[PDB]
Design a protein around this motif. Structure first.
Motif, PDB file in Angstrom:
ATOM      1  N   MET A  86       0.847  -1.167   0.000  1.00  0.00           N
ATOM      2  CA  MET A  86       0.000   0.000   0.000  1.00  0.00           C
ATOM      3  C   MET A  86       0.887   1.221   0.000  1.00  0.00           C
ATOM      4  SD  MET A  86      -3.198  -0.714   2.724  1.00  0.00           S
ATOM      5  CE  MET A  86      -3.784   1.133   2.502  1.00  0.00           C
ATOM      6  N   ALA A  87       0.861   2.007  -1.069  1.00  0.00           N
ATOM      7  CA  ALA A  87       1.660   3.228  -1.129  1.00  0.00           C
ATOM      8  C   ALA A  87       0.715   4.376  -0.883  1.00  0.00           C
ATOM      9  CB  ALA A  87       2.318   3.386  -2.466  1.00  0.00           C
ATOM     10  N   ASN A 101       8.715  11.727   3.440  1.00  0.00           N
ATOM     11  CA  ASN A 101       8.702  11.360   2.021  1.00  0.00           C
ATOM     12  C   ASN A 101       8.397  12.625   1.245  1.00  0.00           C
ATOM     13  OD1 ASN A 101       8.112   9.252   3.807  1.00  0.00           O
ATOM     14  ND2 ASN A 101       7.247   7.999   2.149  1.00  0.00           N
ATOM     15  N   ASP A 124      13.309   5.130  -2.246  1.00  0.00           N
ATOM     16  CA  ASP A 124      12.978   5.495  -0.895  1.00  0.00           C
ATOM     17  C   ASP A 124      12.563   6.938  -0.741  1.00  0.00           C
ATOM     18  OD1 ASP A 124      15.237   6.826   1.149  1.00  0.00           O
ATOM     19  OD2 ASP A 124      13.761   5.655   2.256  1.00  0.00           O
ATOM     20  N   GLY A 125      11.246   7.149  -0.771  1.00  0.00           N
ATOM     21  CA  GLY A 125      10.713   8.485  -0.594  1.00  0.00           C
ATOM     22  C   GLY A 125      11.500   8.919   0.613  1.00  0.00           C
ATOM     23  N   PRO A 185       3.054  -4.376   3.428  1.00  0.00           N
ATOM     24  CA  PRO A 185       4.078  -3.340   3.374  1.00  0.00           C
ATOM     25  C   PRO A 185       3.506  -1.953   3.111  1.00  0.00           C
ATOM     26  CG  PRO A 185       4.889  -5.240   2.323  1.00  0.00           C
ATOM     27  CD  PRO A 185       3.436  -5.520   2.589  1.00  0.00           C
ATOM     28  N   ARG A 186       3.941  -0.977   3.903  1.00  0.00           N
ATOM     29  CA  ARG A 186       3.522   0.415   3.739  1.00  0.00           C
ATOM     30  C   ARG A 186       4.652   1.177   3.031  1.00  0.00           C
ATOM     31  NH1 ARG A 186       6.810   4.953   5.618  1.00  0.00           N
ATOM     32  NH2 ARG A 186       5.433   6.783   5.443  1.00  0.00           N
ATOM     33  N   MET A 187       4.316   1.864   1.948  1.00  0.00           N
ATOM     34  CA  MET A 187       5.330   2.592   1.201  1.00  0.00           C
ATOM     35  C   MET A 187       4.925   3.971   0.676  1.00  0.00           C
ATOM     36  SD  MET A 187       7.155  -0.712  -0.729  1.00  0.00           S
ATOM     37  CE  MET A 187       6.490   0.245  -2.289  1.00  0.00           C
ATOM     38  N   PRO A 188       5.887   4.711   0.095  1.00  0.00           N
ATOM     39  CA  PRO A 188       7.311   4.400  -0.126  1.00  0.00           C
ATOM     40  C   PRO A 188       8.093   4.079   1.154  1.00  0.00           C
ATOM     41  CG  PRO A 188       6.610   6.490  -1.108  1.00  0.00           C
ATOM     42  CD  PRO A 188       5.648   6.152  -0.056  1.00  0.00           C
ATOM     43  N   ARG A 189       9.155   3.292   1.019  1.00  0.00           N
ATOM     44  CA  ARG A 189       9.974   2.954   2.174  1.00  0.00           C
ATOM     45  C   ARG A 189      10.963   4.073   2.439  1.00  0.00           C
ATOM     46  NH1 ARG A 189      12.565  -3.076   2.712  1.00  0.00           N
ATOM     47  NH2 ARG A 189      12.500  -3.272   0.426  1.00  0.00           N
ATOM     48  N   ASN A 190      10.842   4.743   3.586  1.00  0.00           N
ATOM     49  CA  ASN A 190      11.774   5.815   3.957  1.00  0.00           C
ATOM     50  C   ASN A 190      12.699   5.287   5.058  1.00  0.00           C
ATOM     51  OD1 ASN A 190      13.173   8.110   4.740  1.00  0.00           O
ATOM     52  ND2 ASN A 190      11.371   9.442   4.753  1.00  0.00           N
ATOM     53  N   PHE A 191      13.962   5.044   4.720  1.00  0.00           N
ATOM     54  CA  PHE A 191      14.900   4.498   5.696  1.00  0.00           C
ATOM     55  C   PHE A 191      15.288   5.460   6.817  1.00  0.00           C
ATOM     56  CE2 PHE A 191      19.208   6.227   5.238  1.00  0.00           C
ATOM     57  CZ  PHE A 191      19.014   7.075   4.154  1.00  0.00           C
ATOM     58  N   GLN A 192      14.569   6.569   6.931  1.00  0.00           N
ATOM     59  CA  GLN A 192      14.847   7.539   7.980  1.00  0.00           C
ATOM     60  C   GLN A 192      13.657   7.622   8.915  1.00  0.00           C
ATOM     61  OE1 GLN A 192      16.570  11.427   6.522  1.00  0.00           O
ATOM     62  NE2 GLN A 192      16.706  10.280   4.595  1.00  0.00           N
ATOM     63  N   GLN A 193      12.794   6.611   8.854  1.00  0.00           N
ATOM     64  CA  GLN A 193      11.598   6.587   9.689  1.00  0.00           C
ATOM     65  C   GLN A 193      11.352   5.308  10.492  1.00  0.00           C
ATOM     66  OE1 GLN A 193       8.507   7.664   6.704  1.00  0.00           O
ATOM     67  NE2 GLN A 193       8.669   9.720   7.596  1.00  0.00           N
ATOM     68  N   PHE A 194      10.850   5.495  11.713  1.00  0.00           N
ATOM     69  CA  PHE A 194      10.517   4.405  12.627  1.00  0.00           C
ATOM     70  C   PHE A 194       9.011   4.198  12.460  1.00  0.00           C
ATOM     71  CE2 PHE A 194      12.379   8.214  14.891  1.00  0.00           C
ATOM     72  CZ  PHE A 194      13.688   8.043  14.446  1.00  0.00           C
TER      73      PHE A 194
END
Lengths: 311, 311, 311, 311, 311, 311
Positions: free
Chosen positions: B48-49, B167, B190-191, D30-39
């Motif tokens: 889910m985006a 994002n 990666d937003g 999965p929730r996206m976009p995947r932001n590698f700067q978020q918890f």
């Protein structure tokens, strides 16, 4: 029409320059194979630093910048916002405040910025920073004066106009396009952000800078008077009623002691708030600072606290 | 009374929409047990985006958004700030610029935003971004134009109006409520934020967008002329006085070569600043770009540098 | 008295040598200031690698070691366990199996190790490894043969005699002091451990090694025959009853095809267990391997699977 | 000739099998976009687990293995060391001890291992483990019995014969080829190592295992008697001379209380060493254990500590 | 001259205070030696928390601050921006909203801030935050209202005026110097940033705060009516035409049910947007909230959704 | 029957003891709230250390253990493998070698271990370690002597009998049950593994230990003679033919100089292999070592290298 900073930015940008440093540094010879599962532990290595500076003297072509940008440089180049490039030679640097001065070779048609008196700054004032946080070029950002290391005594300007994850760029300027401080890097070796920006205020930049022109360096003012620790021979002899601190036996050197309104007997225990525990605590804190400093000492003798001026 | 952006925001928000994407993607079958002390290494997985978009054409119901939001979508939904929801079908996408276009099904009482000519932007201009950084909804933030990838040739707008750890949302708008660019994600998959925000400027968005309507895609302009590497047969034969670069033998295709004011012999070595080393260096850089581009080539022949317009 | 390995170790150690490599490598010019909050991204840099080797030919002074130790070397030195040092020149290397061969200059009073036939190994056999995991010197450790990449066809020996967090040292020897394999590094660029050790078995070391002496390199045997993918013109024409795999049209080249007992029509889909999906899947897997290999192909034609011998 | 384990390994390996599990599990979309700067912070996802087992009953074709390997399985396959493959159905599992039992469909010519009485083990005994730490196959390793959770009362065998960074494989066998325990995973969900290996001892495996055949599960023996906390009505009334612990009012249920040699009044405060603070502390610790357990309770009443046998 | 916030800041700062907390907490006794390669796992430990507060009542000397600053305090001190220090005693705290109230001992010449009605806020409004993100002192920053948890029903103000990597300071004030909210910490135990700031709006602060004065705590309004799950006896009996949700059997308690315009039969499935799955889903969500709350319930019965007011 | 170590282990375990330390240490007062996004930066804190020791003198009840276990202890307890517990008082400790000595109060029926002469060890010898890597108790493991810091001059025993991720336990014993060394922690403050184990050899343990009984500490032998740096007045005057090193002017102190066979003029540049650059390089390396040391100095004067014995 719409409000914009572009108008004043066009009058300021010509004073802001780009600095390309090429330098060499002594490094450890890599030990291999590299095993990423091990905690381990000389040759010259060429590096390239990059940063921003502000033209502070157009005739002489003096440019202020950060010591973490120009340190260990072997060749330094400068590009004006118009495209022109010049060579520059180093003239002075100061790791403590992260300020350094360079001189353009063959300066021609240069515009120096006007420096404002930083003593006039106030917390809610607006500010804009001009620098190069990612190496991509000159980026400008704005915000306000978040904190003042004095007005709100060896100050520091804290501003929310600072870019996330970037290297403390160069100039901090007010709405009339005047220099109010140079943004610095507190975490030196790593041009980096703590979450908010720090800057040496313009007056200090001016003082620090005149010293590098005059001496190649900023003269450290390590200057007590000549005293004797608390609890010692000539120290314990006196008061000791509200003890616990740094005793002061003499004052004759007349080094901002015959000027600090300080005389024998005193017992200083402050330096802008932080309690002066030991006597060497004083010798050190007051010696790593830049001449002309305005630090304040909460002195004990039942009412006494004056402000000093290094030298 | 007090200054506020609320007034213009109320005229803009109706054009900003919320996008809920439901899509499926091919993924690796998990290998287990999972041992967190090991460095290891197909099925469909639903995802889910979520993101933001701006209504660019009210009659047609065209909505611009980011390709990293709508990629691999199977069902896309749209909610207007008033609450209404519509279904939308994809119409075009572009991974390079991270721009994508969608069409609302049964558009009704829609308000499109007015797009400003981005060529008019200047660094100190004010901007406000409108997006959804945490999935919590529509969040608006403001700042200024920090850098311009041209004005200050295939530009990019850098703005300090960008949320930390979020994002890259949607719209970048000026004080009159006009679209000046769409905020994008440079680190695609990666937003994410680099510390400052980037946006495709509105004019490019407009060009990129008309192409997706017309072709389902943005046509790549990979177009040199037909030359021959430097040092080769027909290349070395000539000059070679200030060599080192990409040679150009022909120009007859008349593809912005009879338009670039370029003819046989030339030796290009620039593409908006970055030195064009090899000949394929050129073939690649100038081919991954979007038609209509305005890139500039510093050409060698003792004075020559013109700007091209793809196609 | 008490059982010990010291006795045989004293007969083996003289064959095990220490290798000190001094080499230079092309590296990126450091970009600074270094900001530890940024994800960023040529000059020669001297490095020092270190490792172990085994004397395989005393008259010639041939020493086998790992390619990850001797790669990019400019000067290589060798110290025998007695203290003597020699210079050595490179003679061949092989990144795939991580094996390399060097030659001692002025060999004198050298003891070569006796190599055992690795085809005789069995899982519970005892083994001892001799190497230099931390750079501190020659360290010996023991264990057993944990797995065999064939006996239990292009094998590999897995042994629990491998040091944690260390660099895959050198020799793998059995209880009679004979070489049964050279311990290698699967994670090449990083002499490192996966948790258990791998070693090329002695017979392969011998084959790999004779090739480097004879050709400066190990000749790759990329050799199918000349076939035509499954589902194509001459392929689909036949069977297709239990399809799904790599078709084989010809065999006349007589390259272990007139030897593999393979003829037109066949449809291979195996290479030591792993299913051969495509036809190029075969062309690649069977081409990156070292001549003399003994790989096995599960061939389809209703009963057919023979073992090949490269060349 | 040379000592080796190969001889006994060849008599044991036929009893050790390979288990390939194919299962499905409920996972978050999965929730996206995947932001590698978020918890940040349902669908079915297919997984593939893999592991080892030992044939414990040849006629019935019962195979013991780990619950972390066979959990959530939908299809389980078994391969004997000779190559033969069978289908297997689950028969029982136990997350607490990480033991599970499966049954081969159409067992034929199977060899069960002989189980040794684990009560006979001693710390310096030799052991060898047989498992699959990386998914690469059957790997065997050896060492000794490092610790015994009783001999040296609901024991555990600690052995240095355990692979670094691997998944606790299967069998733990002694020098005569007899099963002395099954290696387990203490950190369950993650087949993983703590630095040394743990195993359920064979006798417990046997007990745990007979229960899964008989009930589909191991019956928990949560059984005190029926007492009343310390300091309460019927509890405080008595002694309270050396208080601080878990009181015991009754014992009539005759559940290893008329067997524990325990009667009214008592005050237990131990369970194999660890001090029994509260009364529920007891109710819980003694209830999560597997029937037939042999735990010991240091009981207070001026001399009293007997060993219980669940049920 | 130049626009600045300094003018209003000078009228507000006197109301903003600095809070120094000294407290003790129960902690685990360190187990050693410390091995940084191990995943492991009572005494009192003194701690020092620090933060900001706003003077909300000058005569009484009531100061609002964050519960994560004053929690477990044993001694709390307060310093006014002028330098004066006072002792303060705790009066109430609330972990849910992270709001707490303290009382100054011997208040004298205090200036309370004027609180604005937060119901009047709008997204583009300007805001400035005043707090202490690094412990270095009172730092002020500005931005706008990025999101409203209602206006744009148990709201929250999201503002881009929040410092990176800092602890959610204290006050959120508008351009006239009025309190519009207190900045809080969503990630409680860790005064920390998510990338944007959250604040309880002033009206809620006022309500939350009057409750702590009146009861030592904020009274939780856990209040349904008395219903019976969907699909049960008295529930299934009715409609079930558009089922799936939380049924409501009774309403007589007259707790915002005879006020919610709710009567027997209903089937609530909303609480400000989020679908109310189960019946206890409701009992929990609506019970952890602070009295006086204004939450909204999308009720099912073919048209029904009213707003409640706790109590 | 089957080979086992249990037999000798039963004769050794009684000498190995468990040590429970309770100590207090000065620590920083926690600063809060804790923000996990910040790089930040006194009270007494109680800690509990745990470890192993070996009974070295039964009548006196002397127990050797590690300084990282008994450091800062306030109360130390000892449990024999039979269950008996005693109190112990500290008698000496040595951070450099990580060895410490304790004395049991009221020793009774104690069994001391027999110490072997470590000078007799050889690399392939078998060893077994006895310690407590996880705090779970006494765990024993075996392996061989991997390296010798001399035999293969201030040695160290490297053994593969060391547990992964554990704290360097206690005893290192040979097959006859004799102490050959105490396993130590090189990474002191962190009982931890580097991948292989280190141990002080028994003879050094004996020497180190007799010193702590006799002086409360191990006397450091910082002893050159009295020389004068190379290139100085009395140094340059002489040879300087093969210069580069540490000069030696005098030798009269007769401190292993009239014993080292060393006299005026010399120029030492070695200390067990590592080149002695400067003169203070020598003063330091040779002064941090434990009396009785046997270090070797490669001395220059055209042939000269003798071994010293501290004092």
């Amino acid at each position: 029409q719409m409000p914009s900073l572009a108008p004043m930015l066009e009058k300021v940008m010509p004073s802001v320059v780009s600095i390309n440093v090429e330098g060499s540094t002594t490094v450890n010879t890599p030990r291999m194979p590299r095993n990423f599962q091990q905690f381990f532990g000389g040759q010259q290595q060429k590096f390239m630093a990059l940063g921003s500076g502000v033209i502070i003297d157009a005739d002489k072509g003096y440019v202020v910048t950060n010591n973490h940008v120009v340190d260990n440089a072997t060749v330094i180049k400068v590009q004006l916002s118009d495209g022109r490039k010049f060579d520059a030679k180093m003239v002075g640097k100061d790791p403590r405040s992260d300020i350094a001065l360079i001189q353009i070779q063959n300066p021609k048609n240069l515009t120096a910025i006007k420096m404002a008196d930083s003593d006039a700054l106030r917390v809610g004032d607006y500010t804009v920073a001009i620098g190069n946080p990612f190496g991509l070029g000159e980026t400008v950002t704005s915000g306000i004066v978040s904190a003042l290391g004095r007005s709100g005594y060896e100050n520091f300007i804290q501003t929310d106009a600072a870019i996330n994850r970037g290297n403390a760029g160069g100039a901090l300027v007010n709405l009339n396009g005047e220099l109010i401080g140079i943004n610095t890097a507190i975490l030196a070796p790593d041009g980096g952000n703590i979450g908010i920006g720090f800057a040496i205020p313009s007056n200090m930049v001016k003082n620090l800078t005149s010293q590098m022109v005059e001496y190649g360096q900023v003269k450290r003012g390590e200057l007590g008077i000549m005293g004797t620790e608390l609890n010692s021979e000539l120290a314990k002899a006196m008061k000791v009623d509200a003890q616990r601190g740094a005793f002061v036996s003499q004052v004759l050197p007349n080094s901002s002691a015959a000027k600090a309104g300080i005389k024998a007997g005193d017992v200083i225990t402050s330096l802008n708030g932080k309690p002066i525990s030991s006597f060497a605590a004083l010798r050190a804190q007051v010696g790593t600072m830049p001449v002309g400093s305005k630090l304040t000492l909460g002195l004990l003798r039942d009412g006494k606290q004056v402000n000093v001026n290094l030298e």
